[PDB]
Amino acid sequence: HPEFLKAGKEPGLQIWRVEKFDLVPVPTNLYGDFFTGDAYVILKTVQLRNGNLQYDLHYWLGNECSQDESGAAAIFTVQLDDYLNGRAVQHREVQGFESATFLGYFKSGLKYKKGGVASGFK
Ligand SMILES: [Ca+2]
Ligand SMILES: [Ca+2]
């Protein structure tokens, strides 16, 4: 797991996955890929015209995702928003019910994969 120190410094996208009650950053090569069995936090840092940073926080919930994965993502989201002074706008993304905002981040492939890390409860 990574802290919030490496978060919203630079424009771009950061994606962690919930993995046994724990944020694990996603490899860049797998950005745009989501397991239907897992839950995710996504941070959109966009640079404004006046040079200031805008933040859009999305937790994303796989359709086959456990209640701990689900619950952890929503928690981290708040905790990280609080960290960024509550400057982020929070969105709940449910697989197959995502905002046009969230889908706009993924012009090429938004590719759903089957499976995912198992719940914390073994
Ligand atoms: Ca899972
Ligand atoms: Ca906020």
Numbering used by the authors: 29 to 150
Article sentences:
Bonsai gelsolin or fragment 28–161 of gelsolin represents a single domain of gelsolin family of proteins with slight tail or portion of g1-g2 linker of gelsolin which allows it to bind actin. For this step, extension of the tail is necessary which is achieved upon binding to Ca2+ ions or exposure to low pH.
Any case, our crystal structure showed two Ca2+ ions bound to each chain of 28–161 and the G1 domains were arranged next to each other with few interactions stabilizing the interfacial contact. Each chain showed the typical gelsolin domain architecture of five β-sheets sandwiched between the two α-helices, with long helix running parallel to the β-sheets whereas the small helix was perpendicular to the β-sheets. Importantly, during refinement, we could not identify any electron density corresponding to the g1-g2 linker, possibly due to inherent flexibility across these residues. In our crystal structure, four Ca2+ ions were present in the entire assembly, two bound to each monomer, including both Type I (G65, E97, V145) and Type II (D109, G114, A116) Ca2+ binding sites. The interaction analysis revealed that the dimer is stabilized by one classical hydrogen bond between K150 → Y87, a salt bridge between H29 → E21 and numerous weak non-bonded interactions. Alignment of Cα trace of one chain in our crystal structure with same residues in the crystal structure of Ca2+-activated N-terminal half bound to actin provided an RMSD value of 0.45 Å. Comparison of the two states of dimer of 28–161, one seen from our crystal structure bound to Ca2+ ions and other model fitted inside SAXS data based envelope to represent Ca2+-free dimer state showed that the difference lies in the relative orientation of the g1-g2 linker. Of particular interest is the residue Ala146 which acts as a fulcrum of this differential positioning with almost 180° flip of the tail region after it.
